[PDB]
Design a protein around this ligand. Structure first.
Ligand SMILES: O=P(O)(O)O[C@H]1[C@H](OP(=O)(O)O)[C@@H](OP(=O)(O)O)[C@H](OP(=O)(O)O)[C@@H](OP(=O)(O)O)[C@H]1OP(=O)(O)O
Ligand SMILES: [Mg+2]
Ligand SMILES: [Mg+2]
Ligand SMILES: [Zn+2]
Ligand SMILES: [Zn+2]
Ligand SMILES: [Zn+2]
Ligand SMILES: [Zn+2]
Lengths: 193, 50, 188, 111, 193, 292, 261, 49
RNA sequence: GUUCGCGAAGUAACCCUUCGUGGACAUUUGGUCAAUUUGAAACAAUACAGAGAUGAUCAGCAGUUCCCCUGCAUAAGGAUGAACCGUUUUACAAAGAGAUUUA
């Protein structure tokens, strides 16, 4: 469906045009499933029209909230160590392509190359032995039958050493306040008043 | 002839109701019977006051 | 916008940029023997290059007989240079034109930022390393050069640019179309 | 699309200076270039009387009419124009002259 | 395909989703080619979507480090007010733009503790959530808007447009009802003929 | 009424021979061929393994006003086209019945929304009013250019030679061809006579007939077929000078033949329409001279 | 049989040899919805068909013969079918056996399967009307077909008699020199619909002529549907054959009432 | 050479010469206008001749 | 092809291989749609016309339409969006005079 000049494409042109109302839903499902900084690549499950009109990403990105806080906290640490020791950080140019050149195809250009290393904190082995095997997976502990229900990925359950280890990584992003008297005239009931 | 009537599974992207346009139609009047306009007869005297 | 279209009409931005590139070459061959060039060559310039702020290339390329010893890349009004760093045979120029604002109009910062970005970029094609980059702010008629010099050009190029910024016929068209848009005359 | 548009899309292979040559050569062959009588919307400042259908152009009535640069040149150098106007009842063109020394107009054929 | 079905072949839609005219337009063309909010607000969403997808393409092609990719996405989501122009066509997005600006002040002055002023902060997770919640609320909007646009293409506009009264036409509609009431009361006082 | 709509009017021969037919209803399918206004498209297939979808082309209102089916648009009784139906009733009532149709789009739509019957649709859809007219059809079955210089052309037409066995020619000259009697009917009569049927595959015979000049010629490939064409024709007419001519015998007509003994080609008959009429006028005397 | 059923149908044009789907450029920008050229004027837009049907050569068995297809291949008639023996539609000149299959179907749609219309197109071109069983073609545009050879007034008719005789049984062929146009009437409508698409945009040259290398440069001939024949020598033939058609139908129709009783 | 028709401004523009425009036929009457229809048709066909 | 049987041959000794033969497992896709001229996009351009109420120049709202266009729109634009600006004869009678009939 690059060059739709034939008469056979007359029905499929109507399919492209009548899919334009569903296109904001395809943008939300694509941007919510965007790969996080510790991921090289991300296989998503898609639903597509058979005329190639629309391609919805048919997944919802669900995470373990203590694991997800620990993953961003490790990249928060890894990016403050990065900006500390880089001699010069080259921010890229926007937009990354010229508007005359078409979006180059995935298979002739992207798929053949080794991706890169992502942002991963090194995870010292004696302090982080319970998480370092599985912390930076796409879906962490997805096929472990005792930590999660299964590959439908709901209702996790951890042990104490794994849970205190994620607690320890998460210290740049945790709450760090334990008494509720800190929120005295600063809770939402005082905000409503 | 006993004929089963079924519905076609529409494509959700193609416009359903392909024959539906915004067109304008004039309609004929179906006048089979005349309605008798049943007034009364005629207090009809009138000067030039009106 | 319409004042800027009337000021920069008839492709003046491109005609300004060819005028500095031509005026540098007329000063390079005037003192060509002390520099010991075999030839100074202005390159074939893409017409979109003069107003392409994304990337650039070299304009004027210097080929040398003996192998030049260049310094560390320093600013135009730098005092001293240590020429013991790199020993190259070929240098380049780039003439950059920008239009400043109230915020970002330090031409010394702009030329250093572009030189340290374009030489580290893989897409921006320079024929050799160890070149200089001349930047001119067309809004504030300021000039600055940032790059490594081999010898003698830093007093030569700063004496040349003081003549160029006053005597360039394309810059005179720029300064006159500003004064007609501004309706300012100079008494006495 | 918009009254004010910052960017007009050019073809990906284009340049301004090579076009100026090319465009100038095209500018000799068109029918719009060779005929230059300027078409201008105007009002007549000096009531008319038609000479064929004796219609009267009230006081100052709108016309889309035709301005022509006259071969004459008032004094050593002052421009002078000739304006033409069609009649509402009949097909007839009436002509002007703009005298710069005597500020009022003087007219000719048809009115 | 929507541009070209409307006969607007003198408008060029770039690959970075910039819409520019290819020639100096006549007035009947400028009236005809005046696209509405639902076209442009759909076009600016695709500009925002492509601009994020292109940075992952730049990362995968080898041109961009993983720290620059995380900084690149953090730059996009905080500067959509100057990289797209989405605010021109739905100015309620000013809330989402000043939310991502206010999140940037919180993130930077916790990221840049004991660091210098520089680019490489890539904690794009809070500003990512703002736009995903903006996309949550304009799915029902643009499905209604573009759905009316496409059915107006396939079917034409309705002929039964009945204009409501407004401040613009209140004095006009007052007289049409006042003249009918006077014409009624006199036509009933008349004896005949 | 969009929720109360009539069932579709389709023929029995459109539906075919099978008992149960799976038909697909689309509530606003195509627009009508006649009134250009939308309707419920029914479409179906005769058998399950068929390869032709039979669509309903017209709406039910246009099918009722004409009393025709929606698929093949023949009349529901008598299964004939509309143009032949309104011509058969015109032979009974001795006045022209005719359904007239709009060429304007606002009047194609207007003419459909009225509840009348059109043409012969009052006669048909009443079985009493249809059957007596069939009985009235049965009584009908109880009845059951003088200025032209043509002399250059008539030298080339044979007109003076005889239809014997002895000349062995490919071409022949057929004259006395009426303005009726199509070109296919003369090739079929010759090919029936020789048994060289499906002649257009092998190209055994090639025939040119003018229909203005009332004359023609037929050329054979393989001259041995020429003696088969001579010998399979029995009846001949001898002109009272001599010079016997064979008769081809199209039903009720008589077509005379003489061996050309060369290939006549096109344009032998005439090179202008005004010129060809005088050759038929030239011949009409020779036919009367041949017979009487 | 010997010409048609014996062999199988042959690929006329290779699929790489098929023409480009975009038309010849008559505008400034191509339009993607309507596959046409937009800006600029409209220039001309009729060209000589590069392809032509050799009826005794290209005919043969196809996939549609074994499947019981009723409809003829449209691009067989244009000389353009790339599928050959793998094509779902028929690749032969219509015969009495073929039109007998189409007898229930020809009333609403042509021999190629395309649906007919209420009234004719304005220039009498296109598919046809179901309201008139038209069997007569208007062969026009002969000057661009001949590439402006003078030939004559009889030769031109000889070309028309040679070409259209291969496309089916013919009722009559009339050529009018003053109007420079021909009228070909067929025995069946299905041949007339077949020969209309076969001879649209073609050329009546033959190779035996010098211009055969420049056959593509011309305009091409128009085969369109013919109007009624205005002379009363033919008008009386129309009501005579309409009379015989009515008597042949009344015999068929009283047997329906005989069975109904 | 025939007279050219006026060009259609819009899509459903009506050729009033082409057809009886919005044919509101008279209501069916009892008095049997059958000989009268023949005589007008003959008189109208006579007028066109 | 798989699986359960039954039979025959060979290796066997009841198992393996071969081919005969009953079962079971699995069961009717798609098309409203064919690939350039002849079944229907439009715009630009050339030429001509030239722009509501008035004396002249301007703001506009509506209305009736078997015109619509842009717009998401029941908001608003489209020249006050356009078209209007022409054509124009009988429910027809009473009274009171001079020529022409008539028979
Ligand atoms: O110039 P300032 O007013 O002091 O602020 C700047 C400015 O951000 P703000 O103006 O919103 O504060 C820079 O970004 P822009 O505003 O130009 O988009 C930002 O740099 P980045 O956006 O690239 O991160 C920089 O912060 P930093 O130097 O840490 O990058 C920050 O200065 P402060 O950090 O002092 O607020
Ligand atoms: Mg308005
Ligand atoms: Mg208005
Ligand atoms: Zn006048
Ligand atoms: Zn209908
Ligand atoms: Zn039927
Ligand atoms: Zn085929």
């Amino acid at each position: 469906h690059s060059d739709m000049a034939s008469k056979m494409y007359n029905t499929d042109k109507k399919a492209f045009l009548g899919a334009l109302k569903y296109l904001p839903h395809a943008i939300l499902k694509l941007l919510e499933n965007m790969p996080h900084p510790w991921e090289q690549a991300k296989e998503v499950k898609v639903l597509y029209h058979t005329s190639g009109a629309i391609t919805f990403v048919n997944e919802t990105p669900r995470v373990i909230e203590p694991v997800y806080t620990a993953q961003w906290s490790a990249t928060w640490i890894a990016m403050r160590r990065e900006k500390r020791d880089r001699t010069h950080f080259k921010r890229m140019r926007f937009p990354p392509f010229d508007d005359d050149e078409p979006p180059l195809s995935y298979e002739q250009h992207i798929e053949n190359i080794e991706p890169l290393d992502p942002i991963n904190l090194p995870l010292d082995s004696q302090d982080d032995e319970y998480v370092k095997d599985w912390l930076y997976d796409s879906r962490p502990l997805e096929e472990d039958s005792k930590k999660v229900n299964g590959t439908s990925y709901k209702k996790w359950s951890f042990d104490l050493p794994e849970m205190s280890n994620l607690y320890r990584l998460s210290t740049p992003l945790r709450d760090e306040v334990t008494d509720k008297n800190y929120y005295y005239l600063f809770d939402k009931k005082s905000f409503f008043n | 002839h006993h004929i089963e009537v079924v519905s076609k599974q529409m494509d959700p992207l193609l416009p359903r109701f392909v024959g539906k346009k915004a067109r304008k139609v004039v309609a004929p009047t179906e006048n089979d019977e005349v309605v008798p306009v049943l007034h009364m007869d005629g207090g009809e005297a009138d000067p030039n006051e009106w | 916008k319409i004042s800027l279209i009337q000021i920069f009409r008839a492709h003046l931005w491109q005609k300004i940029h060819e005028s500095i590139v031509f005026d540098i070459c007329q000063i390079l061959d005037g003192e060509l023997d002390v520099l010991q060039i075999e030839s100074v060559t202005k390159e074939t310039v893409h017409p979109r290059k003069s107003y392409k702020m994304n990337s650039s290339a070299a304009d004027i390329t210097m080929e040398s007989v003996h192998e030049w010893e260049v310094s560390k890349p320093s600013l135009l009004h730098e005092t001293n240079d240590s020429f013991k760093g790199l020993i190259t045979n070929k240098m380049w120029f780039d003439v950059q034109l920008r239009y400043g604002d109230y915020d970002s109009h330090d031409i010394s910062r702009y030329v250093r930022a572009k030189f340290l970005d374009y030489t580290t970029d893989n897409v921006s094609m320079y024929p050799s390393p160890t070149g200089v980059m001349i930047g001119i702010d067309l809004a504030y008629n300021m000039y600055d050069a940032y790059g490594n010099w081999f010898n003698g050009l830093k007093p030569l190029i700063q004496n040349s640019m003081r003549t160029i910024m006053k005597a360039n016929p394309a810059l005179y068209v720029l300064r006159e179309r500003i004064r007609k848009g501004l309706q300012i005359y100079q008494s006495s | 699309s918009e009254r004010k548009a910052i960017n007009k899309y050019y073809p990906p292979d284009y340049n301004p200076l090579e076009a100026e040559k090319l465009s100038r050569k095209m500018a000799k062959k068109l029918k719009t270039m060779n005929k230059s009588h300027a078409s201008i919307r105007l009002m007549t400042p000096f009531s008319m009387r038609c000479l064929e259908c004796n219609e009267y152009i009230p006081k100052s009535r709108k016309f889309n009419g035709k301005k022509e640069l006259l071969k004459e040149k008032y004094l050593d150098s002052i421009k002078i124009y000739r304006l033409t106007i069609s009649c509402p009842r009949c097909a007839n063109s009436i002509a002007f002259r703009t005298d710069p020394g005597n500020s009022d107009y003087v007219m000719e054929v048809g009115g | 395909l929507l541009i070209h079905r409307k006969g607007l072949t003198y408008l060029h839609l770039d690959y970075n989703f910039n819409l520019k005219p290819t020639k100096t337009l006549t007035t009947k063309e400028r009236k005809k080619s005046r696209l509405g909010n639902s076209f442009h607000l759909m076009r600016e969403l695709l500009k925002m979507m492509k601009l994020i997808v292109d940075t992952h393409v730049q990362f995968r092609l080898g041109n961009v480090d993983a720290f620059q990719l995380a900084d690149g996405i953090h730059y996009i989501l905080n500067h959509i007010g100057q990289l797209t122009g989405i605010y021109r066509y739905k100015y309620k997005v000013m809330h989402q733009i000043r939310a991502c600006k206010d999140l940037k002040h919180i993130i930077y002055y916790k990221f840049n503790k004991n660091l210098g002023k520089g680019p490489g902060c890539g904690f794009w997770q809070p500003a990512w959530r703002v736009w995903l919640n903006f996309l949550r609320g304009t799915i029902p909007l643009l499905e209604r808007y573009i759905g009316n646009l496409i059915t107006r293409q396939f079917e034409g506009r309705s002929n039964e447009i009945v204009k409501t009264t407004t401040k613009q036409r209140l004095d006009a509609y007052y007289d049409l009802e006042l003249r009918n009431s006077v014409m009624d009361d006199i036509l009933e006082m008349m004896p005949e003929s | 009424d969009e929720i109360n709509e009539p069932p579709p009017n389709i023929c029995e021969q459109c539906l075919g021979d099978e008992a149960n037919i799976r038909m697909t209803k689309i509530p606003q399918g195509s627009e009508c061929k006649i009134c250009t206004l939308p309707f419920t498209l029914y479409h179906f297939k005769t058998s399950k393994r068929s390869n032709n979808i039979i669509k309903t082309l017209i709406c039910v209102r246009c099918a009722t006003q004409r009393n025709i089916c929606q698929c093949c648009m023949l009349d529901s009784r008598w299964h004939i086209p509309i143009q032949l139906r309104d011509h058969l009733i015109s032979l009974v009532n001795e006045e022209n019945v005719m359904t007239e149709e709009a060429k304007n789009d606002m009047m194609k739509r207007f003419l459909s929304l009225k509840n009348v019957k059109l043409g012969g649709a009052q006669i048909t859809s009443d079985p009493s009013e249809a059957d007596n007219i069939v009985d009235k059809l049965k009584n009908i079955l109880l009845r059951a250019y003088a200025s032209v210089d043509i002399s250059h052309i008539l030298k080339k037409l044979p007109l003076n030679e005889s239809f014997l066995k002895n000349p062995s020619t490919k071409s022949f000259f057929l004259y006395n061809i009426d303005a009726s009697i199509p070109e296919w009917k003369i090739t079929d009569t010759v090919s029936q006579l020789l048994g060289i049927k499906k002649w257009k595959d092998g190209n055994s015979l090639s025939l040119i007939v003018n229909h203005k000049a009332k004359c023609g010629g037929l050329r054979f490939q393989s001259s041995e077929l020429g003696e088969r064409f001579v010998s399979k024709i029995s009846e001949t007419l001898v002109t009272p000078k001599g010079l016997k001519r064979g008769v081809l015998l199209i039903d009720r007509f008589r077509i005379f033949i003489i061996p050309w003994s060369s290939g006549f080609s096109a344009a032998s008959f005439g090179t202008n329409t005004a010129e060809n009429i005088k050759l038929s006028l030239s011949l009409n005397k020779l036919i009367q001279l041949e017979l009487g | 049989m010997t010409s048609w059923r014996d062999k199988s149908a042959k690929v006329q044009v290779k699929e790489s040899e098929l023409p480009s789907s975009i038309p010849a450029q008559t505008g400034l920008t191509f339009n993607i919805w309507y596959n046409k050229w937009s800006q600029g004027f409209a220039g001309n837009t009729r060209f000589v068909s590069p392809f032509a049907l050799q009826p005794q050569l290209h005919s043969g068995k196809t996939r549609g013969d074994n499947d019981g297809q009723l409809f003829f291949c449209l691009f067989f008639a244009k000389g353009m079918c790339c599928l050959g023996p793998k094509c779902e539609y028929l690749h032969h000149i219509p015969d009495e056996e073929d039109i007998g299959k189409l007898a229930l179907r020809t009333e609403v749609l042509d021999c190629f399967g395309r649906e007919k219309f209420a009234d004719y197109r304005e220039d009498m071109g296109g598919i046809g009307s179901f309201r008139k069983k038209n069997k007569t073609l208007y062969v026009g545009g002969i000057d661009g077909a001949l590439n402006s050879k003078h030939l004559k007034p009889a030769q031109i008719e000889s070309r028309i008699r040679f070409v259209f005789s291969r496309l089916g049984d013919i009722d009559r062929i009339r050529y009018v020199e003053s109007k420079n146009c021909g009228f070909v009437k067929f025995k069946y409508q299905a041949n007339a619909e077949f020969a209309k698409e076969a001879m649209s945009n073609q050329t009546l040259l033959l190779p035996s002529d010098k211009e055969w290398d420049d056959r593509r440069e011309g305009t091409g001939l128009l085969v369109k549907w013919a109007n009624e024949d205005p002379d009363p020598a033919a008008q009386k033939r129309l009501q005579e054959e309409l009379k015989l058609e009515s008597l042949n139908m009344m015999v068929h129709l009283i047997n329906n009432n005989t069975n109904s009783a | 050479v025939a007279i050219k028709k006026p060009k259609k401004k819009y899509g459903t523009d009506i050729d009033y010469n082409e057809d009886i425009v919005y044919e509101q036929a008279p209501m069916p009457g009892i008095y049997d206008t059958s000989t009268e229809d023949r005589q007008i048709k003959k008189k109208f066909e006579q007028f066109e001749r």
